[PDB]
Design a protein around this ligand. Sequence first.
Ligand SMILES: O=C(COc1ccccc1P(=O)(O)O)Nc1cc(C(F)(F)F)ccc1Cl
Ligand SMILES: O=C(COc1ccccc1P(=O)(O)O)Nc1cc(C(F)(F)F)ccc1Cl
Ligand SMILES: [Cl-]
Ligand SMILES: [Cl-]
Ligand SMILES: [Cl-]
Ligand SMILES: [Cl-]
Ligand SMILES: [Mg+2]
Ligand SMILES: [Mg+2]
Ligand SMILES: [Mg+2]
Ligand SMILES: [Mg+2]
Ligand SMILES: [Mg+2]
Ligand SMILES: [Mg+2]
Ligand SMILES: [Mg+2]
Ligand SMILES: [Mg+2]
Ligand SMILES: [Mg+2]
Ligand SMILES: [Mg+2]
Lengths: 228, 228
Amino acid sequence: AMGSMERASLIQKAKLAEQAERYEDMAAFMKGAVEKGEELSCEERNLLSVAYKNVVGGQRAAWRVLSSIEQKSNGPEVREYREKVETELQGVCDTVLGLLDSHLIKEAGDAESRVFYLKMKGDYYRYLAEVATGDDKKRIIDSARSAYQEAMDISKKEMPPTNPIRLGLALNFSVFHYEIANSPEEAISLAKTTFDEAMADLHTLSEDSYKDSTLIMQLLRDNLTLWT
Amino acid sequence: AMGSMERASLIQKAKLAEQAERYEDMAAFMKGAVEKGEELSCEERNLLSVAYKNVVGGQRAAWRVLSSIEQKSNGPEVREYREKVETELQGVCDTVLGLLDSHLIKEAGDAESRVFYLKMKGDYYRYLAEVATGDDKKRIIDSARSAYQEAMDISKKEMPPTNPIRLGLALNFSVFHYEIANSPEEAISLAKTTFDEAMADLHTLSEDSYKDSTLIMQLLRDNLTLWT
Ligand SMILES: O=C(COc1ccccc1P(=O)(O)O)Nc1cc(C(F)(F)F)ccc1Cl
Ligand SMILES: O=C(COc1ccccc1P(=O)(O)O)Nc1cc(C(F)(F)F)ccc1Cl
Ligand SMILES: [Cl-]
Ligand SMILES: [Cl-]
Ligand SMILES: [Cl-]
Ligand SMILES: [Cl-]
Ligand SMILES: [Mg+2]
Ligand SMILES: [Mg+2]
Ligand SMILES: [Mg+2]
Ligand SMILES: [Mg+2]
Ligand SMILES: [Mg+2]
Ligand SMILES: [Mg+2]
Ligand SMILES: [Mg+2]
Ligand SMILES: [Mg+2]
Ligand SMILES: [Mg+2]
Ligand SMILES: [Mg+2]
Protein backbone atom coordinates (compact mmCIF):
# COMPACT_ATOMS: atom_id res chain seq x y z
CA ALA A 1 0.00 0.00 0.00
CA MET A 2 2.98 2.33 0.45
CA GLY A 3 4.45 1.42 -2.95
CA SER A 4 3.50 4.73 -4.52
CA MET A 5 4.91 6.95 -1.80
CA GLU A 6 8.52 8.31 -1.96
CA ARG A 7 10.94 6.80 0.51
CA ALA A 8 11.77 10.21 1.95
CA SER A 9 8.05 10.99 2.39
CA LEU A 10 7.47 7.69 4.22
CA ILE A 11 10.31 8.56 6.64
CA GLN A 12 9.00 12.10 7.17
CA LYS A 13 5.52 10.72 7.84
CA ALA A 14 6.88 8.08 10.28
CA LYS A 15 8.39 10.95 12.28
CA LEU A 16 5.06 12.87 12.17
CA ALA A 17 3.16 9.75 13.27
CA GLU A 18 5.60 9.32 16.19
CA GLN A 19 4.86 12.94 17.29
CA ALA A 20 1.13 12.26 17.04
CA GLU A 21 1.52 8.94 18.93
CA ARG A 22 0.06 7.10 15.94
CA TYR A 23 2.22 4.00 16.18
CA GLU A 24 0.26 1.75 13.82
CA ASP A 25 0.63 4.44 11.10
CA MET A 26 4.31 4.84 12.05
CA ALA A 27 4.85 1.09 11.60
CA ALA A 28 3.09 1.03 8.23
CA PHE A 29 5.21 3.98 7.01
CA MET A 30 8.38 2.27 8.16
CA LYS A 31 7.36 -1.08 6.61
CA GLY A 32 6.83 0.90 3.37
CA ALA A 33 10.34 2.42 3.74
CA VAL A 34 12.00 -0.98 4.32
CA GLU A 35 10.14 -2.33 1.29
CA LYS A 36 11.89 0.23 -0.93
CA GLY A 37 14.83 -2.20 -0.74
CA GLU A 38 17.52 0.28 0.39
CA GLU A 39 19.45 -0.16 3.64
CA LEU A 40 18.28 1.87 6.65
CA SER A 41 20.40 4.50 8.40
CA CYS A 42 20.87 4.52 12.20
CA GLU A 43 18.02 7.03 12.60
CA GLU A 44 15.70 5.00 10.31
CA ARG A 45 16.46 1.74 12.16
CA ASN A 46 15.45 3.45 15.36
CA LEU A 47 12.15 4.64 13.82
CA LEU A 48 11.41 1.07 12.67
CA SER A 49 12.13 -0.29 16.16
CA VAL A 50 10.10 2.38 18.01
CA ALA A 51 7.09 1.91 15.69
CA TYR A 52 6.83 -1.83 16.11
CA LYS A 53 7.79 -1.89 19.82
CA ASN A 54 4.79 0.33 20.51
CA VAL A 55 2.37 -1.60 18.33
CA VAL A 56 3.37 -5.01 19.76
CA GLY A 57 3.59 -3.51 23.24
CA GLY A 58 -0.11 -2.56 23.14
CA GLN A 59 -0.98 -6.10 21.92
CA ARG A 60 1.16 -7.75 24.62
CA ALA A 61 -0.50 -5.64 27.35
CA ALA A 62 -3.92 -6.60 26.08
CA TRP A 63 -3.02 -10.28 25.67
CA ARG A 64 -1.80 -10.31 29.28
CA VAL A 65 -5.04 -8.74 30.59
CA LEU A 66 -7.16 -11.27 28.62
CA SER A 67 -5.00 -14.31 29.48
CA SER A 68 -5.34 -13.42 33.17
CA ILE A 69 -9.15 -13.15 32.89
CA GLU A 70 -9.19 -16.45 30.98
CA GLN A 71 -7.09 -18.22 33.62
CA LYS A 72 -9.44 -16.99 36.38
CA SER A 73 -12.39 -18.27 34.32
CA ASN A 74 -10.94 -21.77 33.99
CA GLY A 75 -18.74 -19.33 27.60
CA PRO A 76 -16.14 -19.31 24.79
CA GLU A 77 -15.94 -15.50 24.60
CA VAL A 78 -12.83 -14.80 26.70
CA ARG A 79 -10.86 -17.50 24.91
CA GLU A 80 -12.14 -16.28 21.53
CA TYR A 81 -11.14 -12.69 22.18
CA ARG A 82 -7.77 -13.65 23.68
CA GLU A 83 -7.15 -15.76 20.53
CA LYS A 84 -8.14 -12.78 18.28
CA VAL A 85 -5.63 -10.52 20.05
CA GLU A 86 -3.05 -13.32 19.99
CA THR A 87 -3.42 -13.85 16.26
CA GLU A 88 -3.04 -10.13 15.58
CA LEU A 89 0.07 -10.02 17.77
CA GLN A 90 1.50 -13.04 15.91
CA GLY A 91 0.76 -11.23 12.65
CA VAL A 92 2.75 -8.17 13.73
CA CYS A 93 5.71 -10.32 14.89
CA ASP A 94 5.65 -12.30 11.64
CA THR A 95 5.63 -9.03 9.64
CA VAL A 96 8.66 -7.69 11.51
CA LEU A 97 10.47 -10.98 11.17
CA GLY A 98 9.60 -10.91 7.48
CA LEU A 99 11.17 -7.46 7.04
CA LEU A 100 14.34 -8.59 8.84
CA ASP A 101 14.47 -11.67 6.59
CA SER A 102 13.65 -9.71 3.39
CA HIS A 103 16.31 -8.41 3.29
CA LEU A 104 17.54 -6.25 6.17
CA ILE A 105 19.79 -8.79 7.92
CA LYS A 106 21.28 -10.15 4.73
CA GLU A 107 22.42 -6.69 3.59
CA ALA A 108 23.59 -5.55 7.02
CA GLY A 109 27.40 -5.70 7.16
CA ASP A 110 28.35 -3.13 9.79
CA ALA A 111 28.27 -4.23 13.41
CA GLU A 112 25.82 -1.48 14.45
CA SER A 113 23.25 -2.52 11.82
CA ARG A 114 23.78 -6.28 12.04
CA VAL A 115 23.59 -6.45 15.84
CA PHE A 116 20.53 -4.13 15.81
CA TYR A 117 18.60 -6.33 13.40
CA LEU A 118 19.63 -9.62 15.05
CA LYS A 119 18.56 -8.22 18.44
CA MET A 120 15.17 -7.30 16.84
CA LYS A 121 14.90 -10.84 15.46
CA GLY A 122 15.52 -12.19 18.97
CA ASP A 123 12.94 -9.79 20.49
CA TYR A 124 10.15 -10.67 18.02
CA TYR A 125 10.69 -14.42 18.34
CA ARG A 126 10.62 -13.79 22.10
CA TYR A 127 7.19 -12.08 21.78
CA LEU A 128 6.01 -15.09 19.74
CA ALA A 129 7.38 -17.37 22.51
CA GLU A 130 5.38 -15.52 25.19
CA VAL A 131 2.09 -16.71 23.60
CA ALA A 132 3.32 -20.08 22.27
CA THR A 133 2.68 -23.50 23.85
CA GLY A 134 4.38 -26.91 23.90
CA ASP A 135 6.89 -28.01 21.27
CA ASP A 136 5.83 -25.19 19.03
CA LYS A 137 7.16 -23.07 21.88
CA LYS A 138 10.57 -24.91 21.77
CA ARG A 139 11.47 -24.15 18.17
CA ILE A 140 10.40 -20.49 18.65
CA ILE A 141 12.47 -20.23 21.85
CA ASP A 142 15.49 -21.64 20.02
CA SER A 143 14.99 -19.17 17.17
CA ALA A 144 15.03 -16.31 19.70
CA ARG A 145 18.14 -17.77 21.40
CA SER A 146 19.98 -18.23 18.11
CA ALA A 147 19.36 -14.64 16.96
CA TYR A 148 20.39 -13.18 20.35
CA GLN A 149 23.50 -15.40 20.41
CA GLU A 150 24.71 -14.29 16.97
CA ALA A 151 24.06 -10.66 17.97
CA MET A 152 26.03 -11.16 21.23
CA ASP A 153 28.98 -12.82 19.43
CA ILE A 154 29.30 -9.86 17.01
CA SER A 155 28.72 -7.25 19.75
CA LYS A 156 31.50 -8.66 21.92
CA LYS A 157 33.99 -8.73 18.98
CA GLU A 158 33.06 -5.41 17.35
CA MET A 159 31.68 -3.00 19.94
CA PRO A 160 32.93 -1.49 23.16
CA PRO A 161 31.21 -2.69 26.32
CA THR A 162 29.42 0.66 26.79
CA ASN A 163 27.91 0.72 23.29
CA PRO A 164 24.12 1.29 23.86
CA ILE A 165 23.14 -1.27 21.21
CA ARG A 166 25.39 -3.85 22.89
CA LEU A 167 23.94 -2.91 26.32
CA GLY A 168 20.32 -3.14 25.17
CA LEU A 169 20.96 -6.48 23.50
CA ALA A 170 22.44 -7.88 26.69
CA LEU A 171 19.55 -6.47 28.72
CA ASN A 172 17.02 -8.12 26.38
CA PHE A 173 18.90 -11.41 26.20
CA SER A 174 18.98 -11.47 30.04
CA VAL A 175 15.17 -10.93 30.06
CA PHE A 176 14.87 -13.77 27.56
CA HIS A 177 16.85 -16.01 29.96
CA TYR A 178 14.75 -15.00 32.98
CA GLU A 179 11.29 -14.90 31.47
CA ILE A 180 11.38 -17.36 28.60
CA ALA A 181 14.20 -19.89 28.97
CA ASN A 182 13.68 -20.54 32.71
CA SER A 183 17.38 -19.70 33.28
CA PRO A 184 17.37 -17.02 36.00
CA GLU A 185 21.00 -17.76 36.89
CA GLU A 186 22.11 -17.13 33.31
CA ALA A 187 19.98 -13.97 33.35
CA ILE A 188 21.59 -12.62 36.51
CA SER A 189 25.10 -13.60 35.34
CA LEU A 190 24.66 -11.87 32.01
CA ALA A 191 23.19 -8.67 33.49
CA LYS A 192 25.93 -8.47 36.14
CA THR A 193 28.87 -9.12 33.77
CA THR A 194 27.43 -6.63 31.27
CA PHE A 195 26.95 -4.03 33.98
CA ASP A 196 30.47 -4.50 35.43
CA GLU A 197 32.17 -4.41 32.01
CA ALA A 198 30.28 -1.25 31.03
CA MET A 199 31.20 0.41 34.35
CA ALA A 200 34.91 -0.20 33.66
CA ASP A 201 34.65 1.44 30.18
CA LEU A 202 32.71 4.57 31.23
CA HIS A 203 35.93 6.56 31.73
CA THR A 204 36.41 6.59 27.94
CA LEU A 205 33.12 8.39 27.20
CA SER A 206 32.05 11.99 26.62
CA GLU A 207 29.30 13.52 28.77
CA ASP A 208 26.58 12.63 26.26
CA SER A 209 27.76 9.06 25.61
CA TYR A 210 28.10 8.57 29.38
CA LYS A 211 24.47 9.59 29.73
CA ASP A 212 23.29 7.16 27.02
CA SER A 213 25.27 4.21 28.50
CA THR A 214 24.44 4.81 32.13
CA LEU A 215 20.71 5.01 31.32
CA ILE A 216 20.81 1.42 30.02
CA MET A 217 23.10 0.27 32.81
CA GLN A 218 20.37 1.49 35.22
CA LEU A 219 17.90 -0.85 33.50
CA LEU A 220 20.33 -3.76 34.02
CA ARG A 221 20.61 -2.67 37.66
CA ASP A 222 16.78 -2.46 38.02
CA ASN A 223 16.50 -6.05 36.77
CA LEU A 224 19.25 -7.31 39.06
CA THR A 225 17.39 -5.70 41.95
CA LEU A 226 14.13 -7.39 40.81
CA TRP A 227 15.86 -10.79 40.43
CA THR A 228 18.04 -10.95 43.54
CA ALA B 1 -18.52 -8.19 10.19
CA MET B 2 -20.17 -8.76 13.57
CA GLY B 3 -23.36 -10.13 12.01
CA SER B 4 -22.61 -13.70 13.01
CA MET B 5 -21.82 -12.99 16.65
CA GLU B 6 -24.53 -13.17 19.38
CA ARG B 7 -25.60 -9.86 20.83
CA ALA B 8 -24.72 -10.98 24.34
CA SER B 9 -21.25 -12.11 23.17
CA LEU B 10 -20.61 -8.73 21.50
CA ILE B 11 -21.48 -6.97 24.80
CA GLN B 12 -19.27 -9.33 26.83
CA LYS B 13 -16.40 -8.75 24.40
CA ALA B 14 -16.88 -4.95 24.51
CA LYS B 15 -16.39 -5.16 28.27
CA LEU B 16 -13.26 -7.33 27.82
CA ALA B 17 -11.88 -4.90 25.23
CA GLU B 18 -12.46 -2.01 27.66
CA GLN B 19 -10.42 -3.89 30.33
CA ALA B 20 -7.66 -4.49 27.80
CA GLU B 21 -7.78 -0.83 26.65
CA ARG B 22 -8.58 -1.99 23.12
CA TYR B 23 -10.97 0.80 22.22
CA GLU B 24 -11.13 0.23 18.47
CA ASP B 25 -12.20 -3.39 19.15
CA MET B 26 -14.63 -2.13 21.82
CA ALA B 27 -16.21 0.25 19.29
CA ALA B 28 -16.53 -2.47 16.63
CA PHE B 29 -18.20 -4.81 19.16
CA MET B 30 -20.61 -2.09 20.21
CA LYS B 31 -21.38 -1.12 16.59
CA GLY B 32 -22.16 -4.84 16.05
CA ALA B 33 -24.48 -4.78 19.11
CA VAL B 34 -26.35 -1.67 17.91
CA GLU B 35 -26.72 -3.28 14.49
CA LYS B 36 -28.70 -6.14 16.06
CA GLY B 37 -31.59 -3.65 16.01
CA GLU B 38 -32.61 -3.92 19.68
CA GLU B 39 -32.62 -0.91 22.02
CA LEU B 40 -29.61 -0.49 24.32
CA SER B 41 -29.80 -0.56 28.12
CA CYS B 42 -28.21 2.16 30.28
CA GLU B 43 -25.06 0.04 30.74
CA GLU B 44 -24.83 -0.71 26.98
CA ARG B 45 -25.28 2.98 26.05
CA ASN B 46 -22.37 3.78 28.30
CA LEU B 47 -20.19 1.11 26.64
CA LEU B 48 -21.03 2.57 23.21
CA SER B 49 -20.14 6.08 24.40
CA VAL B 50 -16.87 5.06 26.11
CA ALA B 51 -15.72 3.05 23.07
CA TYR B 52 -16.18 5.83 20.55
CA LYS B 53 -15.06 8.67 22.87
CA ASN B 54 -11.71 6.92 23.19
CA VAL B 55 -11.31 6.14 19.50
CA VAL B 56 -12.21 9.69 18.38
CA GLY B 57 -10.22 11.13 21.28
CA GLY B 58 -7.01 9.53 19.97
CA GLN B 59 -7.79 10.89 16.45
CA ARG B 60 -8.53 14.39 17.78
CA ALA B 61 -5.25 14.45 19.74
CA ALA B 62 -3.33 13.40 16.66
CA TRP B 63 -5.16 15.84 14.38
CA ARG B 64 -4.29 18.66 16.80
CA VAL B 65 -0.58 17.71 16.86
CA LEU B 66 -0.47 17.56 13.03
CA SER B 67 -2.52 20.75 12.48
CA SER B 68 -0.11 22.62 14.76
CA ILE B 69 2.93 21.32 12.83
CA GLU B 70 1.18 22.24 9.56
CA GLN B 71 0.41 25.78 10.76
CA LYS B 72 4.07 26.29 11.77
CA SER B 73 5.11 25.02 8.32
CA ASN B 74 2.91 27.53 6.49
CA GLY B 75 6.57 19.58 0.91
CA PRO B 76 2.98 18.24 0.87
CA GLU B 77 3.62 15.57 3.52
CA VAL B 78 2.34 17.28 6.67
CA ARG B 79 -0.85 18.36 4.93
CA GLU B 80 -1.27 14.89 3.42
CA TYR B 81 -0.89 13.13 6.74
CA ARG B 82 -3.10 15.63 8.58
CA GLU B 83 -5.76 15.04 5.86
CA LYS B 84 -5.40 11.21 6.28
CA VAL B 85 -5.99 11.49 10.04
CA GLU B 86 -8.82 13.98 9.42
CA THR B 87 -10.58 11.67 6.98
CA GLU B 88 -10.35 8.76 9.42
CA LEU B 89 -11.74 10.95 12.20
CA GLN B 90 -14.60 12.05 9.93
CA GLY B 91 -15.26 8.39 9.16
CA VAL B 92 -15.60 7.53 12.85
CA CYS B 93 -17.93 10.51 13.49
CA ASP B 94 -20.05 9.59 10.45
CA THR B 95 -20.29 5.97 11.71
CA VAL B 96 -21.47 7.08 15.15
CA LEU B 97 -23.93 9.53 13.64
CA GLY B 98 -25.12 6.72 11.39
CA LEU B 99 -25.80 4.44 14.36
CA LEU B 100 -27.74 7.21 16.13
CA ASP B 101 -29.76 7.78 12.95
CA SER B 102 -30.28 4.04 12.28
CA HIS B 103 -32.20 3.72 14.50
CA LEU B 104 -31.19 4.53 18.08
CA ILE B 105 -32.73 8.02 18.37
CA LYS B 106 -35.94 7.10 16.61
CA GLU B 107 -36.64 4.22 19.02
CA ALA B 108 -35.54 6.10 22.13
CA GLY B 109 -38.62 7.20 24.08
CA ASP B 110 -37.43 7.50 27.67
CA ALA B 111 -35.74 10.74 28.69
CA GLU B 112 -32.53 8.99 29.84
CA SER B 113 -32.05 7.27 26.46
CA ARG B 114 -33.27 10.11 24.25
CA VAL B 115 -31.17 12.81 25.94
CA PHE B 116 -28.12 10.47 25.93
CA TYR B 117 -28.32 9.84 22.20
CA LEU B 118 -29.10 13.47 21.30
CA LYS B 119 -26.12 14.61 23.40
CA MET B 120 -23.95 12.07 21.47
CA LYS B 121 -25.30 13.45 18.19
CA GLY B 122 -24.30 16.95 19.34
CA ASP B 123 -20.82 15.74 20.42
CA TYR B 124 -20.03 13.97 17.12
CA TYR B 125 -21.21 16.88 14.97
CA ARG B 126 -19.04 19.03 17.26
CA TYR B 127 -15.99 16.83 16.50
CA LEU B 128 -16.80 17.19 12.78
CA ALA B 129 -17.03 20.98 13.30
CA GLU B 130 -13.55 21.09 14.88
CA VAL B 131 -11.96 20.02 11.55
CA ALA B 132 -14.47 21.69 9.19
CA THR B 133 -13.94 24.96 7.29
CA GLY B 134 -16.13 27.73 5.84
CA ASP B 135 -19.82 27.26 5.07
CA ASP B 136 -19.43 23.54 5.34
CA LYS B 137 -18.54 24.38 8.93
CA LYS B 138 -21.83 26.37 9.37
CA ARG B 139 -24.26 23.58 8.56
CA ILE B 140 -22.26 21.17 10.78
CA ILE B 141 -22.23 23.69 13.63
CA ASP B 142 -26.00 24.11 13.32
CA SER B 143 -26.48 20.33 13.33
CA ALA B 144 -24.51 20.14 16.60
CA ARG B 145 -26.52 23.06 18.06
CA SER B 146 -29.85 21.54 17.06
CA ALA B 147 -29.08 18.15 18.63
CA TYR B 148 -27.81 19.75 21.88
CA GLN B 149 -30.87 22.04 21.99
CA GLU B 150 -33.38 19.20 21.67
CA ALA B 151 -31.46 17.27 24.34
CA MET B 152 -31.50 20.33 26.65
CA ASP B 153 -35.25 20.92 26.14
CA ILE B 154 -36.06 17.31 27.14
CA SER B 155 -33.54 17.28 30.01
CA LYS B 156 -35.03 20.41 31.57
CA LYS B 157 -38.61 19.02 31.34
CA GLU B 158 -37.90 15.41 32.34
CA MET B 159 -34.85 15.23 34.59
CA PRO B 160 -33.83 16.73 37.89
CA PRO B 161 -31.07 19.31 37.76
CA THR B 162 -28.56 16.93 39.38
CA ASN B 163 -29.12 14.11 36.87
CA PRO B 164 -25.58 13.20 35.59
CA ILE B 165 -26.77 12.88 31.98
CA ARG B 166 -28.36 16.34 32.21
CA LEU B 167 -25.17 17.72 33.82
CA GLY B 168 -22.85 16.22 31.21
CA LEU B 169 -25.04 17.50 28.39
CA ALA B 170 -24.93 21.01 29.79
CA LEU B 171 -21.17 20.76 30.28
CA ASN B 172 -20.70 19.66 26.65
CA PHE B 173 -23.13 22.22 25.26
CA SER B 174 -21.21 24.94 27.19
CA VAL B 175 -17.95 23.67 25.59
CA PHE B 176 -19.68 23.81 22.22
CA HIS B 177 -20.60 27.48 22.90
CA TYR B 178 -17.06 28.37 24.02
CA GLU B 179 -14.98 26.43 21.53
CA ILE B 180 -17.14 26.14 18.44
CA ALA B 181 -19.86 28.80 18.34
CA ASN B 182 -17.64 31.70 19.50
CA SER B 183 -20.18 32.40 22.29
CA PRO B 184 -18.12 32.46 25.50
CA GLU B 185 -20.81 34.45 27.32
CA GLU B 186 -23.43 31.81 26.54
CA ALA B 187 -20.91 29.18 27.64
CA ILE B 188 -20.26 30.83 31.00
CA SER B 189 -23.98 31.53 31.55
CA LEU B 190 -24.93 27.94 30.86
CA ALA B 191 -22.20 26.43 33.04
CA LYS B 192 -23.02 28.78 35.94
CA THR B 193 -26.81 28.29 35.83
CA THR B 194 -26.34 24.52 35.55
CA PHE B 195 -23.92 24.51 38.45
CA ASP B 196 -26.16 26.67 40.69
CA GLU B 197 -29.31 24.65 39.92
CA ALA B 198 -27.51 21.36 40.63
CA MET B 199 -26.14 22.76 43.92
CA ALA B 200 -29.69 23.58 45.08
CA ASP B 201 -30.89 19.99 44.33
CA LEU B 202 -28.01 18.12 46.02
CA HIS B 203 -29.91 17.89 49.32
CA THR B 204 -32.27 15.36 47.68
CA LEU B 205 -29.52 12.83 46.85
CA SER B 206 -28.08 9.72 48.49
CA GLU B 207 -24.34 9.51 49.20
CA ASP B 208 -23.63 7.72 45.91
CA SER B 209 -25.80 10.00 43.73
CA TYR B 210 -24.24 13.01 45.46
CA LYS B 211 -20.83 11.69 44.46
CA ASP B 212 -21.85 11.19 40.80
CA SER B 213 -23.42 14.69 40.53
CA THR B 214 -20.70 16.60 42.34
CA LEU B 215 -18.01 15.01 40.12
CA ILE B 216 -19.63 16.58 37.04
CA MET B 217 -20.34 19.84 38.84
CA GLN B 218 -16.56 20.02 39.47
CA LEU B 219 -15.99 19.84 35.71
CA LEU B 220 -18.40 22.77 35.22
CA ARG B 221 -16.48 24.61 37.94
CA ASP B 222 -13.09 23.79 36.28
CA ASN B 223 -14.37 25.30 33.02
CA LEU B 224 -15.74 28.41 34.73
CA THR B 225 -12.33 28.87 36.32
CA LEU B 226 -10.65 28.45 32.89
CA TRP B 227 -13.09 30.92 31.25
CA THR B 228 -13.29 33.70 33.83
O1 LIG C 1 7.13 -3.22 30.18
C1 LIG C 1 7.91 -3.84 29.45
C2 LIG C 1 9.27 -4.26 30.06
O2 LIG C 1 9.93 -5.32 29.31
C3 LIG C 1 11.28 -5.26 29.08
C4 LIG C 1 12.21 -4.88 30.08
C5 LIG C 1 13.58 -4.86 29.75
C6 LIG C 1 14.01 -5.24 28.46
C7 LIG C 1 13.09 -5.62 27.48
C8 LIG C 1 11.73 -5.61 27.81
P1 LIG C 1 10.50 -6.11 26.56
O3 LIG C 1 9.91 -7.49 27.03
O4 LIG C 1 11.32 -6.30 25.19
O5 LIG C 1 9.45 -5.06 26.33
N1 LIG C 1 7.61 -4.15 28.18
C9 LIG C 1 6.47 -3.71 27.59
C10 LIG C 1 6.52 -2.49 26.93
C11 LIG C 1 5.41 -1.96 26.28
C12 LIG C 1 5.52 -0.60 25.57
F1 LIG C 1 6.04 0.29 26.40
F2 LIG C 1 6.34 -0.74 24.54
F3 LIG C 1 4.34 -0.18 25.11
C13 LIG C 1 4.22 -2.67 26.31
C14 LIG C 1 4.15 -3.90 26.95
C15 LIG C 1 5.27 -4.42 27.59
CL1 LIG C 1 5.14 -5.95 28.38
O1 LIG D 1 -9.45 16.58 26.80
C1 LIG D 1 -10.61 16.68 26.41
C2 LIG D 1 -11.51 17.72 27.14
O2 LIG D 1 -12.69 18.08 26.37
C3 LIG D 1 -13.91 18.20 27.00
C4 LIG D 1 -14.06 18.85 28.24
C5 LIG D 1 -15.35 18.95 28.80
C6 LIG D 1 -16.46 18.41 28.13
C7 LIG D 1 -16.31 17.77 26.89
C8 LIG D 1 -15.02 17.68 26.35
P1 LIG D 1 -14.79 16.85 24.74
O3 LIG D 1 -14.39 17.98 23.72
O4 LIG D 1 -16.21 16.23 24.35
O5 LIG D 1 -13.79 15.72 24.81
N1 LIG D 1 -11.10 15.94 25.41
C9 LIG D 1 -10.37 14.97 24.82
C10 LIG D 1 -10.46 13.69 25.36
C11 LIG D 1 -9.76 12.62 24.83
C12 LIG D 1 -9.90 11.22 25.46
F1 LIG D 1 -9.67 11.31 26.77
F2 LIG D 1 -11.14 10.80 25.28
F3 LIG D 1 -9.07 10.34 24.92
C13 LIG D 1 -8.94 12.83 23.73
C14 LIG D 1 -8.85 14.10 23.16
C15 LIG D 1 -9.56 15.16 23.71
CL1 LIG D 1 -9.40 16.72 22.98
CL1 LIG E 1 -13.42 -12.31 19.17
CL1 LIG F 1 26.61 -7.95 3.93
CL1 LIG G 1 -0.50 10.24 4.31
CL1 LIG H 1 -40.20 6.32 20.50
MG1 LIG I 1 11.86 7.48 -5.37
MG1 LIG J 1 -20.01 -16.36 28.27
MG1 LIG K 1 -3.55 -19.18 19.01
MG1 LIG L 1 33.86 -1.12 16.67
MG1 LIG M 1 22.20 -19.47 42.45
MG1 LIG N 1 -29.25 -14.16 18.83
MG1 LIG O 1 8.67 17.72 2.65
MG1 LIG P 1 -10.32 17.17 4.61
MG1 LIG Q 1 -37.89 12.21 35.38
MG1 LIG R 1 -19.31 39.75 29.55
